[PDB]
């Protein structure tokens, strides 16, 4: 199928933006330990919002591209609108780029003023720092996309893969609506904030990744459609079942009733399950091949992604999801550690899993690259992957050291924020190091093209 | 055990839990005016919240333990800076003296805030600090 041609820009643009994310992560990582680095010009809070908004946005481009590609194979027909796919690309790229720039080129508050935040306040919330106009831009682009791709599954086959990925996307769009809801009451604010972040990341995205993964197994393997989709259904079932009440894990210390400590810890315990079964899925349907597949780089990506998703979201999430542990660890380098591996492990990795699949057969090259461009990919796989397990280790080491020095002693013996921060330097230095390894590993993954 | 019985577990399994969650969030919202002490949520504090969002403090600090890990928890900062009585006065000073300029220290920008805006910020923080937070953070340091 031809009009899968549209999926390229989205990937390519996504790769660029993700280079951006790293440099800014690298700035922050330096600012930790050289605390005035690039101050006043680029304060920590600006670098962060660039780092974290480039993450969200690039992953979206990945997702979309992914949809634009696999849907038409699944749907058995050409995509509804290539022109809408191309137009949207530019709107959404223009919007991402313009808003990152606002962050850099104007002090946040003046940017508030400038975009008339005054009218309908939505800025200044973690991951929701974009002006109310950029949010709406993001919304419009999303709705057009659902239309373009959703229209493609009304006419045409309905696989379970497409159905499930479609549910995936629609939910992502709808929940993103709560970003326009900014309650005057602080605890009510945080309460609904989590309906975006967590309902995204432990619920509705899981559908998007599962479906993306299920697709790649099907094609990469030959294994029967009926078992993959049966499995695909099992995994989301466990995701939704554990994840919806699970949002309780974010509900311990914010103002909402105590019963959340119980509900949240109980259901949270179950949340690694989808991810484990995701590793089972991975190995077992890429255990029993109807054919050896030219690209063993997709295989790897597919396994790695499930494995990493499980260590990061699965294992690291459990470590600190029970209330009595969370009580001390909440809002700590342990939080940074989990956030990193899990986002990398599930969502970064899956985006590249598909890229490795779609890309060759998109520049019309073939089902894989020349062995030169294959061993590069695998090197880039291993540098980035290893680097991240390193990044999270140093971060955990620093988290645990923070909890010991600041959280556990009583008043008077607990060390101040800024002073325990200084003891942690060595870890942050090593963290920068792993961060450098990563960039190099991205650059390799890139030069595989 | 086939794909159908798998798919329904998903359908109903998630309809049950969505409604259950919507129920509890209904229940939660009716305790909030007691827990967060909305009776004491003044024009001052709602405005303070605005000042907070518009300057992106959460881009560096944590509030009630969510936010950024660069800089201290402000959720309980009242307690650790002369508390109820003199906090407003402190925060007035705190904001005009940034950045401190100790070499190599992490720095806080100068926001050029009005004495009105700072005074709002203070009530917002003072009020934030009295939310029933299930006894979090563990201690004075936050």
């Amino acid at each position, epitope marked *: 199928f031809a009009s899968q041609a549209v999926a390229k820009p989205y990937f390519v643009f996504a790769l660029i933006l993700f280079v951006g994310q790293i440099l800014f992560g690298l700035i922050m990582g330096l600012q930790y330990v050289v605390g005035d680095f690039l101050f006043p010009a680029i304060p920590f809070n600006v670098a962060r919002m660039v780092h974290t908004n480039l993450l969200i946005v690039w992953l979206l481009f990945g997702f979309m591209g992914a949809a634009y590609y696999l849907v038409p194979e699944e749907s058995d027909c050409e995509l509804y609108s290539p022109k809408l796919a191309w137009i949207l690309f530019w709107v959404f790229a223009a919007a991402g780029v313009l808003t990152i720039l606002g962050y850099l080129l104007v002090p946040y508050a003046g940017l508030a003023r400038l975009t008339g935040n005054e009218l309908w306040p939505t800025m200044g919330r973690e991951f929701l720092e974009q002006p109310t106009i950029s949010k709406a831009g993001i919304v419009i682009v999303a709705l057009g996309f659902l239309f373009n791709v959703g229209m493609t599954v009304l006419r045409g086959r309905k696989t379970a893969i497409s159905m499930v990925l479609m549910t995936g996307l629609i939910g992502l769009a709808l929940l993103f609506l709560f970003s326009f809801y900014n309650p005057e009451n602080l605890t009510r604010d945080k309460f609904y904030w989590w309906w975006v972040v967590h309902l995204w990341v432990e619920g509705v995205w899981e559908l998007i990744m599962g479906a993306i993964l299920a697709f790649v197994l099907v094609k990469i393997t030959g294994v029967d459609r009926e078992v993959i989709e049966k499995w695909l259904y099992v995994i989301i079932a466990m995701a939704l079942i554990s994840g919806i009440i699970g949002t309780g894990h974010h509900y311990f210390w914010i103002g909402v009733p105590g019963y959340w400590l119980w509900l949240g810890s109980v259901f949270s315990a179950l949340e690694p399950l989808p991810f484990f079964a995701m590793v089972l899925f991975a190995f077992n349907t890429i255990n029993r091949r109807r054919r050896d597949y030219p690209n063993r780089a997709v295989a790897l990506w597919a396994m790695g992604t499930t494995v990493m998703a499980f260590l990061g979201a699965g294992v690291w999430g459990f470590m600190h999801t029970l209330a009595p542990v969370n009580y001390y660890t909440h809002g700590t380098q342990l939080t940074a550690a989990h956030g990193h591996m899990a986002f990398y492990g599930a969502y970064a990795m899956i985006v590249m899993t598909i890229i490795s699949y779609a890309m060759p057969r998109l520049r019309g090259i073939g089902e894989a690259m020349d062995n030169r461009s294959q061993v590069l990919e695998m090197w880039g796989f291993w540098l980035m992957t290893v680097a991240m397990v390193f990044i999270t280790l140093f971060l955990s080491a620093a988290g645990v050291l923070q909890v010991w020095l600041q959280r556990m002693p009583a008043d*008077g013996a607990a060390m101040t924020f*800024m002073a325990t921060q200084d003891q942690l330097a060595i870890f942050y230095w090593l963290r920068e190091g792993a961060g450098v390894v990563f960039l190099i590993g991205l650059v390799a993954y890139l030069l595989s093209f | 055990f086939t794909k159908g019985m798998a798919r329904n577990i998903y359908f109903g399994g998630s309809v049950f839990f969505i409604l259950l969650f919507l129920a509890l969030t209904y229940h939660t919202e009716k305790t909030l005016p007691e827990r967060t002490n909305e009776a004491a949520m003044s024009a001052a504090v709602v405005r303070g919240k605005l000042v907070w969002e518009q300057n992106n403090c959460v881009g560096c600090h944590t509030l009630l333990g969510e936010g950024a890990y660069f800089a201290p928890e402000l959720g309980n900062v009242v307690g650790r800076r002369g508390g109820e009585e003199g906090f407003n006065t402190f925060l007035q000073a705190w904001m005009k003296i940034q950045p401190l300029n*100790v070499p190599g220290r992490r720095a806080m920008p100068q926001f050029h805030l009005s004495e009105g805006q700072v005074d709002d910020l203070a009530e917002f923080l003072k009020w934030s600090s009295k939310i029933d937070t299930n006894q979090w953070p563990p201690n004075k340091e936050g």
Partner: antibody
Amino acid sequence: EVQLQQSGTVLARPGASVKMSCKASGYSFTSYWMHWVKQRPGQGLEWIGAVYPGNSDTSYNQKFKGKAKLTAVTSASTAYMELSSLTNEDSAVYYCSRSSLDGYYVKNWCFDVWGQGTTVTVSS
Amino acid sequence: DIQMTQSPPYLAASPGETITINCRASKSIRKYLAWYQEKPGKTNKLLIYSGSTLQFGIPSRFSGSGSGTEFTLTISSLEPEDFAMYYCQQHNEYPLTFGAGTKLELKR
């Protein structure tokens, strides 16, 4: 309230040794440099040195590298200074004080609270 | 080592008047000068650090200014309790060093 409480007057003979203390209360002892300052009558303040009770490191003014030894005991929130081989030039008031900012890398900052001073008189 | 000399050694003034005192450094210390007040039977008290930043709690009647090498503290409308000894402290370099002080006496 941040307070430093210093020990009473000590009297020594020349060549002898003396150990005075500074008891910190009202803040996180382990998070600030504790500094020590010397003052003799009509004679201007001199920075002796500092200890950081969070990791026990010290820093001495090169002029007091023989004279003085700073240590700290974290469970009692107290810091100590031992002066040695007392000379008549060591009769003076000695202050402890607390760096006005917390952390290990603010080594050379100004102070925000002082002890009241402990007198040392050296005489035969 | 960098050496501080304050001037004048002593100064007489009356309540309600303005006085201003000087602190010079042997070499550049950028902005990092602090001032303390000493009174009999009280602990030394930080007034200004970083050349011009008022410490928490100190009334604004006090102020200071300078960089590099030459610094001043000013009191705006002297008050009865302002008659005290004032010391300056450089906080740019190890070792910390102090001026020998200025005595601000009450005229009669």
